[PDB]
Amino acid sequence: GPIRKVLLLKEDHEGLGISITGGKEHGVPILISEIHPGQPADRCGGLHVGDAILAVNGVNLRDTKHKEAVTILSQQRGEIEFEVVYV
Template sequence: MTSVLTLEAKLERTEKSTPWGFRMQGGKDFNSPLTIQKVNPGSLAAKCGLQVGDIILKIGSTATDSLRHTEAQSNILQSGNHLDLLLQSPALTSRADLTLASNYY
């Protein structure tokens, strides 16, 4: 039986020009959950522990199960320099049961 972890990732940046460093796929319009497709090495997302295959359950306080892909992108863009994600991840790696937080400036 595969267990899953639910993790909170809090990403911060000082400038909007700094990319979060991940790509997502899916959404209501694709009939699949919003999922992390790519994490750029050394990026804020990588430093915060995001991994390919993580499912995005919430962007800020907004549940993603009814969001189209473009709506999710909009929510991320509107988050400014503080992006809070609630993620569900297969517990296949030792990611510790913690709340992930980054304050990389």
């Protein structure tokens, strides 16, 4: 599908509310495998299971290993911009 830009708002006491799988060491994108109900990704409305996360706040995630992506994603705070695509 089309590449989308998606805004997510979170406070510092919560996580993003997603589960991710994949990573460059496995030859697969960073993929959203779960959206936790009621948490910030669910509330933002624009992120879905099956989406690949291509970038976050201008940081490219297309070539990142799994744990690299965890560190990058968990560092982001407040108003967070995602670049995502559903295949």
